[PDB]
Ligand binder design. Sequence first.
Ligand SMILES: O=C(COP(=O)(O)O)[C@@H](O)[C@H](O)[C@H](O)COP(=O)(O)O
Ligand SMILES: O=C(COP(=O)(O)O)[C@@H](O)[C@H](O)[C@H](O)COP(=O)(O)O
Ligand SMILES: [Zn+2]
Ligand SMILES: [Zn+2]
Lengths: 318, 317
Amino acid sequence: PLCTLRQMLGEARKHKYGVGAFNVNNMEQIQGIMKAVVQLKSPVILQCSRGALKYSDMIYLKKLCEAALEKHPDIPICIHLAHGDTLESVKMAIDLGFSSVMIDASHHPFDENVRITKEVVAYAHARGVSVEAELGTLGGIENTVQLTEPQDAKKFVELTGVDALAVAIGTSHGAYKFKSESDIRLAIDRVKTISDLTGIPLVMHGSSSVPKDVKDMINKYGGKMPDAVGVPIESIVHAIGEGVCKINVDSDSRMAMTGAIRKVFVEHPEKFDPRDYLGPGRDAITEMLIPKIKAFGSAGHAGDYKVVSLEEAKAWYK
Amino acid sequence: PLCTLRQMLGEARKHKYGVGAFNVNNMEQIQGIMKAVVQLKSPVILQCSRGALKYSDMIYLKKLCEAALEKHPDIPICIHLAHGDTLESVKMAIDLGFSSVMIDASHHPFDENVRITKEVVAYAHARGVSVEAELGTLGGIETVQLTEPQDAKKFVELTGVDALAVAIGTSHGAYKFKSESDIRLAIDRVKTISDLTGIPLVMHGSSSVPKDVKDMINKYGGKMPDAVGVPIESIVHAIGEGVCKINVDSDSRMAMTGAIRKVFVEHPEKFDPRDYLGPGRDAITEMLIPKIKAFGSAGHAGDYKVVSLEEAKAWYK
Ligand SMILES: O=C(COP(=O)(O)O)[C@@H](O)[C@H](O)[C@H](O)COP(=O)(O)O
Ligand SMILES: O=C(COP(=O)(O)O)[C@@H](O)[C@H](O)[C@H](O)COP(=O)(O)O
Ligand SMILES: [Zn+2]
Ligand SMILES: [Zn+2]
């Protein structure tokens, strides 16, 4: 059933596992993601960006998530606004039925980040909805990136009461996160300190790994992504063990679908039925995701708890 | 709103136009079709084959169609089972909430076709759901059984179906005739079947395989050099003689495929599915606009108040 981010990640903090949060834009993506979490009996977070909602005129995406919730009632499923920037985007998402939202005001100074985030927490928690916020900015270390200062994270959470905190540790969006695989620099040592000082679930953004087979397929069949590099899965597993409970992954699913289509285009150029290539694209998403979900550690946990509904969740904040 | 095939094609027969029936399989395909019919204020039929329902684990396509019905409350939209073979398949589309079903028993001798079809008509009509059947078999003229108009009249009298698919030389796929220079159809009989039966007629296998769409696929790595469709002028003529529903699937498949192949070649560094499926969706829309304009349904979406499935039950009691 629909599940809050607070309960879902609370459970991952407790057992020291992490839950992948996968952005969705259409039917095949959601199916690719659900087949993997179902096969592994794992909880899941489906997140929707403003770009996704625009792409699907909103109602179509809302309906697709309904289908998922209905087809697999036994899977704790969190529907999350991936990256809202105002209170307005939050009311909109909550109206569509989401159980969680992210409010990102990290590019503002501390007190303004606190203020904007506090407004959202009041509105969301009044309806039982979870809130994720961010302190610090994304970008690679190798000047202007602002990594999370643990002592300030402690203060931020105390002042806002967010349910989860996105941390800045050297990751960034996209398929080109580091200049090479031989020199990957992350600031994961502080995760444990942030987790202990805040006492709450942490979130990592820009965390696709850019798996070898997915990249090789794209470049083998006419794609041009020779220098792609993502976050090593070992690093993510280390951060998970230190308190990271939610890992945002999008690029990996993007590449897996693109590589799959590119291969069908080359091996069978006479085929023109979209199911002929979107099918293998959906499945390549499932196959790429299975070893990832196991490493995150959420496999087997879908049946660990009884899902609290949004209505009952209101009591946590009163 | 959700509309029955009986009413939608009834309005088309009366005003001498045809309504496109487009097969859907996922979100982008439904969006591209909807944008075209919404832009042209045209009624529309979205049809789902058994393959589509398997491709989409059924529930996802049901929900997407609901999204279309809710987003555009003013467009009469018929949700039809594209090609059921058994009463079992019809029952499953009805349980998903479809407003129309096709039961094709055309490969069976006349009597058995009639028997199988009647059983589906009894079940469907008790819910107000429309039924399309077929007399004659698909396939080109150059074993194919073209529709015998006098038999078509008896078949319709005996079954009570709301629409009849006719066999006049069309066939499914992108290689309908050996060359564009030798295209032979049996359109002469459409008018006769129309008058003899008194009901809306349906054309299957009627994608036109438009040149631009064909050129794009072959320009960017595709391999469909000999593809050929039904000329649009031939469909326009059949519509004026009684054809009210025209099934089109290959054209949208090709329009989406050519668009993705072009982005792949022009921006080989792009890997976000929205970057190519977006253009794939718009290609479908642009390819469909001139097609819907020629079918004649533009501007008719507001001609009638839509009778719901519940009220429709009265038509058959
Ligand atoms: O961190 C994320 C994924 O990063 P990634 O490149 O997969 O390592 C997500 O939360 C992003 O915010 C998301 O992928 C952005 O999607 P759009 O805004 O382009 O739709
Ligand atoms: O007549 C039709 C379209 O023909 P076409 O090749 O587009 O001229 C449809 O009714 C077909 O039945 C439909 O395209 C079949 O779809 P699937 O069974 O492959 O899903
Ligand atoms: Zn994000
Ligand atoms: Zn058909």
